[PDB]
mmCIF file of C-alpha atoms and ligand atoms in Angstrom:
data_model
loop_
_atom_site.group_PDB
_atom_site.id
_atom_site.type_symbol
_atom_site.label_atom_id
_atom_site.label_comp_id
_atom_site.label_asym_id
_atom_site.label_seq_id
_atom_site.Cartn_x
_atom_site.Cartn_y
_atom_site.Cartn_z
ATOM 1 C CA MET A 1 115.865 -66.932 59.953
ATOM 2 C CA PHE A 2 117.812 -66.085 56.850
ATOM 3 C CA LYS A 3 118.411 -69.065 54.574
ATOM 4 C CA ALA A 4 121.569 -67.910 52.690
ATOM 5 C CA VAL A 5 124.534 -65.543 52.810
ATOM 6 C CA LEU A 6 125.681 -64.103 49.496
ATOM 7 C CA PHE A 7 129.367 -63.193 49.619
ATOM 8 C CA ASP A 8 131.341 -60.686 47.666
ATOM 9 C CA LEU A 9 134.895 -61.953 47.069
ATOM 10 C CA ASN A 10 137.268 -59.007 46.836
ATOM 11 C CA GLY A 11 136.818 -56.949 49.996
ATOM 12 C CA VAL A 12 135.063 -59.635 52.010
ATOM 13 C CA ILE A 13 136.583 -63.135 51.658
ATOM 14 C CA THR A 14 140.028 -61.785 50.661
ATOM 15 C CA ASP A 15 141.187 -58.855 48.648
ATOM 16 C CA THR A 16 143.259 -58.966 45.447
ATOM 17 C CA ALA A 17 142.706 -55.292 44.557
ATOM 18 C CA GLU A 18 146.497 -54.790 44.723
ATOM 19 C CA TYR A 19 147.047 -57.375 41.961
ATOM 20 C CA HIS A 20 144.204 -55.974 39.853
ATOM 21 C CA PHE A 21 145.795 -52.532 40.271
ATOM 22 C CA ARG A 22 149.305 -53.683 39.379
ATOM 23 C CA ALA A 23 148.064 -55.562 36.275
ATOM 24 C CA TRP A 24 146.098 -52.491 35.125
ATOM 25 C CA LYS A 25 149.074 -50.145 35.684
ATOM 26 C CA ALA A 26 151.355 -52.525 33.778
ATOM 27 C CA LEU A 27 148.895 -52.606 30.851
ATOM 28 C CA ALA A 28 148.583 -48.807 30.796
ATOM 29 C CA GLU A 29 152.361 -48.477 30.870
ATOM 30 C CA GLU A 30 152.697 -50.991 27.972
ATOM 31 C CA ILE A 31 150.405 -48.974 25.817
ATOM 32 C CA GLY A 32 151.857 -45.616 26.782
ATOM 33 C CA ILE A 33 149.144 -44.180 29.017
ATOM 34 C CA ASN A 34 149.988 -41.912 31.920
ATOM 35 C CA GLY A 35 147.969 -41.601 35.099
ATOM 36 C CA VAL A 36 146.936 -45.098 36.194
ATOM 37 C CA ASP A 37 147.974 -44.533 39.815
ATOM 38 C CA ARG A 38 146.491 -45.643 43.149
ATOM 39 C CA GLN A 39 144.141 -42.659 43.288
ATOM 40 C CA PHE A 40 142.876 -43.300 39.774
ATOM 41 C CA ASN A 41 142.380 -46.983 40.610
ATOM 42 C CA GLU A 42 139.558 -45.925 43.009
ATOM 43 C CA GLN A 43 137.542 -45.345 39.816
ATOM 44 C CA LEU A 44 138.404 -48.946 38.721
ATOM 45 C CA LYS A 45 137.756 -51.249 41.664
ATOM 46 C CA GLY A 46 133.985 -51.900 41.709
ATOM 47 C CA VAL A 47 133.912 -51.661 37.912
ATOM 48 C CA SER A 48 134.002 -54.581 35.439
ATOM 49 C CA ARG A 49 137.035 -55.766 33.462
ATOM 50 C CA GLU A 50 135.695 -54.168 30.267
ATOM 51 C CA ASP A 51 134.566 -50.958 31.961
ATOM 52 C CA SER A 52 137.980 -50.717 33.702
ATOM 53 C CA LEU A 53 139.872 -50.871 30.401
ATOM 54 C CA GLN A 54 137.488 -48.350 28.867
ATOM 55 C CA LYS A 55 138.189 -45.826 31.667
ATOM 56 C CA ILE A 56 141.921 -46.210 31.162
ATOM 57 C CA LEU A 57 141.549 -45.651 27.392
ATOM 58 C CA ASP A 58 139.249 -42.657 27.998
ATOM 59 C CA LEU A 59 141.856 -41.133 30.249
ATOM 60 C CA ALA A 60 144.175 -40.873 27.236
ATOM 61 C CA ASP A 61 141.393 -40.169 24.698
ATOM 62 C CA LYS A 62 142.657 -43.362 23.055
ATOM 63 C CA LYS A 63 140.475 -45.212 20.526
ATOM 64 C CA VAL A 64 141.045 -48.874 19.664
ATOM 65 C CA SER A 65 139.514 -51.500 17.438
ATOM 66 C CA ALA A 66 137.053 -53.912 18.979
ATOM 67 C CA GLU A 67 139.655 -56.659 18.396
ATOM 68 C CA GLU A 68 142.426 -54.576 20.037
ATOM 69 C CA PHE A 69 140.178 -53.995 23.072
ATOM 70 C CA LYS A 70 139.593 -57.700 23.642
ATOM 71 C CA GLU A 71 143.367 -58.335 23.325
ATOM 72 C CA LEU A 72 144.270 -55.669 25.905
ATOM 73 C CA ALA A 73 141.728 -57.056 28.424
ATOM 74 C CA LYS A 74 143.120 -60.549 27.906
ATOM 75 C CA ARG A 75 146.700 -59.358 28.411
ATOM 76 C CA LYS A 76 145.762 -57.666 31.713
ATOM 77 C CA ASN A 77 143.882 -60.782 32.841
ATOM 78 C CA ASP A 78 146.770 -63.163 31.917
ATOM 79 C CA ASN A 79 149.115 -61.013 34.029
ATOM 80 C CA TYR A 80 146.637 -60.842 36.951
ATOM 81 C CA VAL A 81 146.265 -64.649 36.902
ATOM 82 C CA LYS A 82 150.033 -65.047 37.240
ATOM 83 C CA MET A 83 150.028 -62.749 40.279
ATOM 84 C CA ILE A 84 147.352 -64.747 42.121
ATOM 85 C CA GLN A 85 149.069 -68.124 41.765
ATOM 86 C CA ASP A 86 150.549 -67.780 45.254
ATOM 87 C CA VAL A 87 147.221 -66.911 46.961
ATOM 88 C CA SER A 88 146.852 -69.305 49.917
ATOM 89 C CA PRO A 89 144.549 -70.025 52.890
ATOM 90 C CA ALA A 90 146.511 -67.375 54.834
ATOM 91 C CA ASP A 91 144.890 -64.777 52.564
ATOM 92 C CA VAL A 92 141.418 -65.480 53.918
ATOM 93 C CA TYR A 93 140.141 -62.333 55.716
ATOM 94 C CA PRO A 94 139.837 -62.296 59.512
ATOM 95 C CA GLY A 95 136.794 -64.145 60.909
ATOM 96 C CA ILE A 96 135.661 -65.405 57.460
ATOM 97 C CA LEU A 97 136.676 -69.058 57.772
ATOM 98 C CA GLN A 98 134.950 -69.360 61.155
ATOM 99 C CA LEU A 99 131.830 -67.673 59.736
ATOM 100 C CA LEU A 100 131.694 -70.102 56.822
ATOM 101 C CA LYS A 101 132.067 -72.985 59.278
ATOM 102 C CA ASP A 102 129.222 -71.637 61.492
ATOM 103 C CA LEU A 103 126.865 -70.985 58.549
ATOM 104 C CA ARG A 104 127.428 -74.480 57.159
ATOM 105 C CA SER A 105 126.972 -75.919 60.639
ATOM 106 C CA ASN A 106 123.548 -74.165 60.810
ATOM 107 C CA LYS A 107 122.615 -75.288 57.289
ATOM 108 C CA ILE A 108 122.634 -71.730 55.965
ATOM 109 C CA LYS A 109 123.470 -71.691 52.258
ATOM 110 C CA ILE A 110 126.702 -70.070 51.140
ATOM 111 C CA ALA A 111 127.012 -68.525 47.670
ATOM 112 C CA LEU A 112 129.621 -66.344 45.917
ATOM 113 C CA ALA A 113 128.368 -63.149 44.298
ATOM 114 C CA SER A 114 131.621 -61.898 42.799
ATOM 115 C CA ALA A 115 131.966 -59.851 39.621
ATOM 116 C CA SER A 116 135.325 -61.647 39.020
ATOM 117 C CA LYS A 117 135.658 -64.556 36.639
ATOM 118 C CA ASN A 118 138.702 -65.604 38.708
ATOM 119 C CA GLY A 119 136.406 -66.207 41.704
ATOM 120 C CA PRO A 120 136.408 -70.033 41.500
ATOM 121 C CA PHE A 121 140.201 -70.248 41.193
ATOM 122 C CA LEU A 122 140.678 -67.978 44.184
ATOM 123 C CA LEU A 123 138.346 -70.109 46.358
ATOM 124 C CA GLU A 124 140.447 -73.164 45.372
ATOM 125 C CA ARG A 125 143.684 -71.392 46.270
ATOM 126 C CA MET A 126 142.252 -70.419 49.706
ATOM 127 C CA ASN A 127 140.882 -73.968 50.232
ATOM 128 C CA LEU A 128 137.283 -72.665 50.541
ATOM 129 C CA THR A 129 135.617 -74.505 47.582
ATOM 130 C CA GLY A 130 133.973 -77.067 49.865
ATOM 131 C CA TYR A 131 132.044 -74.396 51.846
ATOM 132 C CA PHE A 132 130.358 -72.826 48.797
ATOM 133 C CA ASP A 133 126.968 -74.191 47.843
ATOM 134 C CA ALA A 134 127.217 -72.269 44.580
ATOM 135 C CA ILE A 135 129.159 -69.616 42.690
ATOM 136 C CA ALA A 136 127.206 -67.120 40.564
ATOM 137 C CA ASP A 137 128.807 -66.913 37.131
ATOM 138 C CA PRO A 138 129.440 -63.238 36.211
ATOM 139 C CA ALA A 139 129.804 -64.273 32.559
ATOM 140 C CA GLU A 140 126.176 -65.497 32.497
ATOM 141 C CA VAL A 141 124.610 -62.287 33.909
ATOM 142 C CA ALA A 142 123.465 -59.328 31.759
ATOM 143 C CA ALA A 143 125.210 -56.632 33.806
ATOM 144 C CA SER A 144 127.710 -56.054 36.589
ATOM 145 C CA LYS A 145 127.062 -54.476 39.977
ATOM 146 C CA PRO A 146 125.312 -52.175 40.800
ATOM 147 C CA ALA A 147 122.782 -54.240 38.839
ATOM 148 C CA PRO A 148 121.298 -56.848 41.250
ATOM 149 C CA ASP A 149 121.688 -59.662 38.736
ATOM 150 C CA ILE A 150 124.702 -61.318 40.306
ATOM 151 C CA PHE A 151 123.044 -61.388 43.804
ATOM 152 C CA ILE A 152 119.774 -62.657 42.321
ATOM 153 C CA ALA A 153 121.699 -65.429 40.523
ATOM 154 C CA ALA A 154 123.694 -66.236 43.663
ATOM 155 C CA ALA A 155 120.486 -66.628 45.688
ATOM 156 C CA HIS A 156 118.749 -68.720 43.042
ATOM 157 C CA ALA A 157 121.827 -70.971 42.651
ATOM 158 C CA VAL A 158 121.260 -72.134 46.200
ATOM 159 C CA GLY A 159 117.463 -72.326 45.964
ATOM 160 C CA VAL A 160 116.484 -69.148 47.909
ATOM 161 C CA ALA A 161 115.036 -65.740 47.115
ATOM 162 C CA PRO A 162 117.193 -62.694 47.898
ATOM 163 C CA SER A 163 114.508 -61.703 50.433
ATOM 164 C CA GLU A 164 115.615 -64.743 52.457
ATOM 165 C CA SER A 165 119.297 -63.731 52.116
ATOM 166 C CA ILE A 166 121.987 -61.548 53.650
ATOM 167 C CA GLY A 167 124.476 -59.902 51.276
ATOM 168 C CA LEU A 168 128.040 -59.051 52.433
ATOM 169 C CA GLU A 169 129.761 -56.275 50.446
ATOM 170 C CA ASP A 170 132.599 -53.731 50.599
ATOM 171 C CA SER A 171 131.712 -51.263 47.799
ATOM 172 C CA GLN A 172 128.966 -48.833 46.820
ATOM 173 C CA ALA A 173 128.077 -50.767 43.648
ATOM 174 C CA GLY A 174 127.993 -53.989 45.701
ATOM 175 C CA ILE A 175 125.721 -52.560 48.427
ATOM 176 C CA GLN A 176 123.326 -51.171 45.805
ATOM 177 C CA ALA A 177 123.190 -54.502 43.953
ATOM 178 C CA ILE A 178 122.210 -56.233 47.217
ATOM 179 C CA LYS A 179 119.547 -53.615 47.964
ATOM 180 C CA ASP A 180 118.021 -53.857 44.509
ATOM 181 C CA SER A 181 118.058 -57.692 44.701
ATOM 182 C CA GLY A 182 115.865 -57.456 47.836
ATOM 183 C CA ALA A 183 118.476 -59.108 50.098
ATOM 184 C CA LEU A 184 119.676 -57.541 53.371
ATOM 185 C CA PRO A 185 123.077 -55.752 53.011
ATOM 186 C CA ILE A 186 125.688 -55.670 55.708
ATOM 187 C CA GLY A 187 128.661 -53.592 54.594
ATOM 188 C CA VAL A 188 132.264 -53.807 55.739
ATOM 189 C CA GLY A 189 134.500 -50.762 55.860
ATOM 190 C CA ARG A 190 133.805 -47.060 55.927
ATOM 191 C CA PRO A 191 130.315 -45.610 55.281
ATOM 192 C CA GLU A 192 131.482 -43.443 52.376
ATOM 193 C CA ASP A 193 132.705 -46.619 50.629
ATOM 194 C CA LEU A 194 129.414 -48.460 51.243
ATOM 195 C CA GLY A 195 126.172 -46.428 51.344
ATOM 196 C CA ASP A 196 123.274 -45.492 53.654
ATOM 197 C CA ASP A 197 120.468 -47.039 55.681
ATOM 198 C CA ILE A 198 122.516 -50.194 56.174
ATOM 199 C CA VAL A 199 124.370 -51.942 58.950
ATOM 200 C CA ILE A 200 128.144 -51.460 58.639
ATOM 201 C CA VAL A 201 131.024 -53.212 60.388
ATOM 202 C CA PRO A 202 134.561 -51.760 60.390
ATOM 203 C CA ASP A 203 136.239 -55.080 59.458
ATOM 204 C CA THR A 204 135.343 -58.692 58.750
ATOM 205 C CA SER A 205 136.182 -59.920 62.292
ATOM 206 C CA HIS A 206 132.781 -58.396 63.142
ATOM 207 C CA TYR A 207 130.953 -60.681 60.656
ATOM 208 C CA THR A 208 129.927 -63.412 63.076
ATOM 209 C CA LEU A 209 126.889 -65.607 62.880
ATOM 210 C CA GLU A 210 125.655 -64.094 66.187
ATOM 211 C CA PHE A 211 125.839 -60.607 64.707
ATOM 212 C CA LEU A 212 124.236 -61.607 61.423
ATOM 213 C CA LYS A 213 121.298 -63.175 63.281
ATOM 214 C CA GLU A 214 120.835 -60.082 65.501
ATOM 215 C CA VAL A 215 120.862 -57.784 62.469
ATOM 216 C CA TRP A 216 118.415 -60.107 60.742
ATOM 217 C CA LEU A 217 115.903 -59.883 63.605
ATOM 218 C CA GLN A 218 116.384 -56.105 63.828
ATOM 219 C CA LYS A 219 115.460 -55.731 60.149
ATOM 220 C CA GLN A 220 112.353 -57.954 60.113
ATOM 221 C CA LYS A 221 108.894 -56.361 60.248
HETATM 222 O O1 FBP B 1 133.017 -58.499 42.906
HETATM 223 P P1 FBP B 1 134.327 -58.583 43.610
HETATM 224 O O2 FBP B 1 134.624 -59.985 44.224
HETATM 225 O O3 FBP B 1 134.539 -57.395 44.582
HETATM 226 O O4 FBP B 1 135.532 -58.403 42.526
HETATM 227 C C1 FBP B 1 135.644 -57.107 41.899
HETATM 228 C C2 FBP B 1 136.516 -57.221 40.662
HETATM 229 O O5 FBP B 1 135.824 -57.925 39.611
HETATM 230 C C3 FBP B 1 136.032 -57.304 38.353
HETATM 231 O O6 FBP B 1 134.952 -56.457 37.979
HETATM 232 C C4 FBP B 1 136.289 -58.359 37.276
HETATM 233 O O7 FBP B 1 137.218 -59.361 37.765
HETATM 234 P P2 FBP B 1 138.051 -60.273 36.731
HETATM 235 O O8 FBP B 1 138.796 -59.283 35.845
HETATM 236 O O9 FBP B 1 138.924 -61.118 37.615
HETATM 237 O O10 FBP B 1 137.030 -61.023 35.948
HETATM 238 C C5 FBP B 1 137.221 -56.390 38.583
HETATM 239 O O11 FBP B 1 137.264 -55.384 37.584
HETATM 240 C C6 FBP B 1 136.946 -55.911 40.003
HETATM 241 O O12 FBP B 1 138.097 -55.410 40.661
HETATM 242 MG MG1 MG B 2 134.284 -55.758 46.244
#
């Protein structure tokens, strides 16, 4: 049997992409950059805080000091944090709470493999802290998804190898990170947003323990 499930946050447990988007747009508008719209934000989502800012700057051919850059990222983050203060248990994605209950009931480890440093605060706001055996710290890994580092760390933080793990992701960079960790990906959403040679479910109501076990057995050799 698998021993752990490694969860993405945004796209799987909940999704705060709207707040990330609004904070980025607000920052761009403050510094006088045109074109940070919903279509552009598709380039931003599965990208890090620093890489997101850089893309926005590049869009304007705007150069900043290293100090300026840190200040702009902080400003966006401070604004984003304000927006997520009202996140509640009602923002947990369909089926997720029951899955976390069933995993814990079966003594399968639960770990967060988010690229977001606001991950722990969001789990608290959704009242999910207690279910998480560990939270990989994206500030203590050498690279963001699609590097496998965060999934490797997530697995290790609960005492398992990725090979003994299922990863749950919603993005291309996320799916690739899981693959390269050696864990088994199951994607949620549309194929073109996920990747190939994986099991995909259309929405998180399909992530049940029964399904995860069946997929596990299908993928063992
Ligand atoms: O890995 P997840 O849970 O999908 O979160 C993805 C988000 O994490 C980030 O890379 C960084 O998040 P923070 O800015 O909250 O630290 C965002 O740029 C991206 O939208
Ligand atoms: Mg995601």
